[PDB]
Amino acid sequence: HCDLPCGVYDPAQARIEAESVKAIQEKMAANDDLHFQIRATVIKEQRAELAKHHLDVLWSDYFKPPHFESYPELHTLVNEAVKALSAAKASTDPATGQKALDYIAQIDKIFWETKKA
Amino acid sequence: HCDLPCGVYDPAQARIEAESVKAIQEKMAANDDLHFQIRATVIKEQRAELAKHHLDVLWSDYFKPPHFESYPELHTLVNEAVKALSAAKASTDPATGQKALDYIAQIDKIFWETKKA
Amino acid sequence: HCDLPCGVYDPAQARIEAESVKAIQEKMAANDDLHFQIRATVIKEQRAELAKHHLDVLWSDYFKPPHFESYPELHTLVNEAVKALSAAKASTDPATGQKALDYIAQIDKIFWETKKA
Amino acid sequence: HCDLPCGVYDPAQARIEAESVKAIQEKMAANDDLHFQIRATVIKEQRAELAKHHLDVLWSDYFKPPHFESYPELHTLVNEAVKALSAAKASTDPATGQKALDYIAQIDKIFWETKKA
Amino acid sequence: HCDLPCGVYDPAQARIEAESVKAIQEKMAANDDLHFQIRATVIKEQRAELAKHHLDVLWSDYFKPPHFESYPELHTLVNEAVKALSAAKASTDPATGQKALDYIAQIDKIFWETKKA
Amino acid sequence: HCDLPCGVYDPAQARIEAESVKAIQEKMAANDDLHFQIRATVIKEQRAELAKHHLDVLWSDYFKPPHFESYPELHTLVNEAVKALSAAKASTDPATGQKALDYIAQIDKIFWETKKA
Ligand code: 3NI
Ligand code: 3NI
Ligand code: 3NI
Ligand code: 3NI
Ligand code: 3NI
Ligand code: 3NI
């Protein structure tokens, strides 16, 4: 995942960050304090960006050309996932964070299928 | 390109970094001093990574579903471009840097066409 | 622009980031939503910083003593441009982003003139 | 793990980076090409640093005074783990990478025990 | 402090960042303008994080087993110092910034004592 | 030094990093091991870059127009200092690191004079 290549990848990296994004949105609904809302927004932006980065790495470095042929929906799937993360950045609604997590789950399923193959 | 969204994008960001990658490769072919080789390798790695990031952003943020339907080869084209940048990191051969640049020029063309549409 | 040196520089990197800064200010004029305003501020801060960095690099790395002799106003000009960017971080008024872009255009002109010599 | 706090932590973040560190060391033993050795060194340095960062965060943010009381060896354990990572940065011997992984697994065990209580 | 190791460390790095944190909190009380409050919060967050990083480096890289033996309360002290910085991130009260600075000064004193022996 | 502005600045941030640069160069003069030479070069590059950044910040944010009028050679001085750091990046000779330190010490002096005015 470092581009050496090192041969070590795990969608878990993107997932843990996307999980913080949703967790942050949930906490934002429980505290309307201005300063807390600013910090939560700041931090959610950073964790969603990392989640996007991790997905980007899987897309560009892990997945090889044959994988996109074997899973015709893979390009679209990863693109929708990073876009859902962009949508979560601009929202305090936990559903947006959950949507990104749902796409990550599908990508994770494909990732492991390709690992065992 | 900042995900606000700000509406400002330009493949030139990716291109300028890819140009540095090739330029460093050319300089490496001309000076075999150990320390220069280390520094050149370290720096080429960073610039190639920034070029990958910029292309990733065009792919994840600028390009929308309509664009992928109009250019069915776009997903693969950007994926190949970033993969070419990974190969450039692993190489001192300027041709690898040029390969990345050729792909970037193709993405640049499509980018501007979508901007005029 | 990577300090190898690689021999590749372009005021365009500073310009593109400064354009995002102003573009963000324009979007802040239009929408008073708290979360949007927090996110716009956060991201504007990040892009203005990158723009200052790019200018600092032109100043520290690209421009040499003969350039400062030929253009005795260059130091002041670049210093005014980065200070204008600091002013843009602290403002939502596009006039501040515009002022930074104006100084950058002046720096860009001098840059290309030095590429002619 | 983002200091909001968000309530999401997983030692897996530290483990995955440490796994890359060891995997890179193994590749370095098998390929003596100069450029590969430089790239592997640069990248191992980066992943080891990320691993130390993740451990530092668990120590500073996740673990609380009651945890250090229940596990009097914990401060020492995390300190040894990060020092083991510093040692791996300075080494191409996979055994150093393995030692950091051994400590991370002991930290992971304690982490999950605090989740049961 | 760079993990080479280089043999150069100075608690002053943590202190200067902690001083910005407090200085920012002092300024937050004198201007309730929204944008200023957002920038102040955003920037305080960043400076506090850097201060935590500098303390983490002292703890992980500079201080060694003999030092922890001679100062049995050092682990707790550094851990309390970084937690104080986390508290300062979540507060506009300069008292929180002060508390972190006070812990840092204690660490600074111990640091110079270990340097004299 | 964070651009809020926070009112906290200290040339010591730049000095400490330049000190590491020189300390690393001294170590490189003594130890010829390839892997150590790679790590030292990699890390020296990073610390020299941070030193340049700290100097750039004093120049762009701390020093104001009246300071440049009061000390006309300040622009040149900071420019030479950052160029000396670029030179240190490209050399293993401690003398280059010392030269950067000498320029920083001249800047430190003017800095404190402006503080007392
Ligand atoms: Ni990897
Ligand atoms: Ni943008
Ligand atoms: Ni360059
Ligand atoms: Ni967190
Ligand atoms: Ni160091
Ligand atoms: Ni500041």
Q: How was this structure determined?
A: X-ray
Q: Do F43 and E4 touch (CB under 8 A)?
A: yes
C54 token code pair: 């790019």
**What is the distance between the alpha carbons of residues B116 and A30, in angstroms, rounded to a whole number?**
45
User: What is the distance of C-alpha D42 from the center of its chain?
Assistant: 17
Q: Is residue A3 classed as helix, strand or coil in its secondary structure?
A: coil
Distance CA F92, CA F25 (A): 5
Tell me which residue of D113, D108, D114 sits closest to D51, measured CA to CA.
Answer: D108
The identity of residue C4, as a single letter, is L
Q: How far apart, in whole angstroms, are the C-alpha atoms of residue E13 and residue E20?
A: 11
Nearest CA-CA distance, residue A79 and chain B, Å? 6
Q: Are the CB atoms for F100 and F19 separated by under 8 Å? A: no
What is the Cα–Cα distance from D33 to D11, expressed in whole angstroms? 34
CB–CB contact C60 F75 (8 Å): no
**Residue F64 exposure: Cα atoms within 13 Å on the Cβ side:** 6
In sequence order, the 6+-apart residues with CB closer than 8 A to the CB of C24 are: B2, B4, B6, C40, C43, C44, C47, C97
* Closest to D25 in 3D by CA, of D2, D12, D44: D44
- Could you tell me where the DSSP H helices lie in chain E? 12-28, 34-57, 65-70, 74-89, 94-116
| Separation of alpha carbons F93 and A63, rounded Å | 44
CB B8 within 8 A of CB B1: yes
Compute the C-alpha angle C16/C19/C23, nearest 5°: 140
**What helix, strand, coil percent values describe chain A, rounded to 5?**
80, 0, 20
Say which residue the tokens 């750039």 belong to: F56
Q: For residues D46 and D24, give the distance between their C-alpha atoms in angstroms, rounded to a whole number.
A: 11
Q: Which residues surround ligand 1, an ion (CB under 5 A)?
A: A 1-2, 6
Structure-token pair, residue C39: 């996110």
- Give dist(CA B37, CA B25) in Å, integer: 10
Q: Which residues of E fall within a CB distance of 8 Å from A43? A: 45
User: Which residues contact residue C14 at a Cβ distance below 8 angstroms, ignoring those fewer than 6 apart?
Assistant: C51, C54, C55, C58, C104, C107
Angle, vertex CA D44, rays to CA D46 and CA E55, nearest 5: 40
Q: In whole angstroms, what is the distance from residue C9 CA to residue C27 CA?
A: 30
Q: How far apart are CA F20 and CA A89, in angstroms?
A: 39
CB pairs under 8 A between D and E: 43
Q: Are F67 and F58 in contact (CB under 8 A)?
A: no
D71: left (phi over 0), alpha (psi -120 to 50) or beta: beta
* Alpha-carbon span A83 to A94, nearest angstrom: 15
What is the CA A82 to chain-centroid distance, rounded?
6
CA dihedral E92, E95, E100, E103 (to 10 degrees): 180
Cβ distance B111 to B18 under 8 Å? Answer: no
Please indicate if the annotation marks B2 as binding a ligand: yes
Chains F and A: 3 or more CB pairs within 8 Å of each other: no
Tell me, in Å, the resolution of the deposited structure: 2.2
Give how far D90 is from chain F: nearest CA, Å: 7
In Å, how far are A30, A107, B7, B12, F61 from B86, measured between CA atoms? 44, 22, 28, 19, 37
| Contact call for residues C93 and C105 (beta carbons, < 8 A) | no
Distance CA D24, CA D22 (A): 5
Residue B92 tokens read as: 């001192």
| Structural domain count of chain F | 1
Interface of D with B in 47-106 (CB under 8 A): none
- In the DSSP assignment, the letter for residue F92 is -
Q: What residue of A is the nearest CA neighbor of B86?
A: A3
Distances (CA, A) of A25 to A39, A87, A94: 12, 12, 5
Residue D43 tokens read as 């990248």
For residues F104 and C83, give the distance between their C-alpha atoms in angstroms, rounded to a whole number: 22
Cβ–Cβ contact A44 with B under 8 A: no
CB-CB neighbours of F30 under 10 Å: 7
How many Å apart are CA C51 and CA C46, to the nearest integer? 9
**Could you tell me the two tokens for A10?**
């795990």
The burial of C30, by beta-carbon neighbours within 10 Å (0-12 exposed, 13-18 middle, 19 or more buried), is given as exposed
Check which CATH number belongs to the domain holding C85 and give it.
Answer: 1.20.120.400
Instruction: Tell me the residue type at C9.
Output: Y
Judged by CB atoms closer than 8 Å, whether chains meet at C60 and F56 is answered as yes
F108 CB contacts (<8 Å, ≥6 apart)? Answer: F11, F12, F15
Nearest to F53 by CA among F18, F103, F91, F7: F18
Alpha helices, H only, C3-61: 12-30, 34-57
Chains in touch with E (3+ beta-carbon pairs under 8 Å) read: A, C, D, F
Cβ distance B89 to B20 under 8 Å?
A: no
Instruction: Retrieve residue C114's tokens.
Output: 């030095």
Characterize B41-72 residue by residue with b for buried, 16 or more Cβ atoms within 10 angstroms of its Cβ, and e for exposed: bbbbbbbbbbbbbbbbbbbbbbbeeebbeeee
CA atoms within 13 A on the CB side of D113: 12
By CA distance, what is E42's nearest residue in C? C42
D6 is in an annotated binding site: yes
- At B36, the amino acid letter reads F
Number of Cβ within 10 Å of residue D98's Cβ equals: 16
What's the CA gap between D79 and D85, in Å, rounded?
Answer: 10
Diameter over CA atoms, chain E: 51
Are the C-beta atoms of residues B59 and A83 closer than 8 Å to each other?
Answer: no
Residues 6+ apart with CB under 8 A from F27: E4, E6, E7, F36, F40
Q: Enumerate long-range contacts of F75-80, CB under 8 Å, 24 or more apart.
A: F75/C68, F75/C75, F75/C76, F75/C79, F76/C68, F76/C75, F77/F103, F77/F106, F77/F107, F77/F110, F78/F107, F79/C59, F79/C60, F79/C68, F79/C75
Query: Are the CB atoms for C44 and C38 separated by under 8 Å?
Result: no
Distances (CA, A) of D12 to A4, B61, C3: 21, 29, 36
Which of F3, F63, F71 is the best residue to mutate to test the C interface, defined by the most C CB atoms within 10 Å of its own CB?
Answer: F3
| CA–CA gap between residue C50 and residue C48 (Å, rounded) | 5
What amino acid occupies position F43?
I
As given in the structure block, the two tokens for residue D52 are 């130390």
Residues A58, E92: Cα–Cα separation, whole Å: 40
Q: Which domain holds residue B93?
A: 1-117
8 A C-beta contact, residue D11 and residue D105: no
Cβ neighbours of C75 (radius 10 Å): 20
For residue F70, how many other CB atoms are within 10 A of its CB? 14
Q: What angle do CA E78, E79, E80 make, to 5 degrees?
A: 90
Question: How many CA atoms lie within 13 Å of B41's alpha carbon, on the beta-carbon side?
Answer: 25
Contact C57, F49 (CB under 8 A): no
Rounded CA-CA distance A69/A74 in Å is 9
- Concatenating the DSSP letter of every residue in D8-19 gives ---THHHHHHHH
Distance between CA atoms of residues B42 and B25, nearest Å: 12
Instruction: Give the pair of three-digit tokens for residue B51.
Output: 């070029």
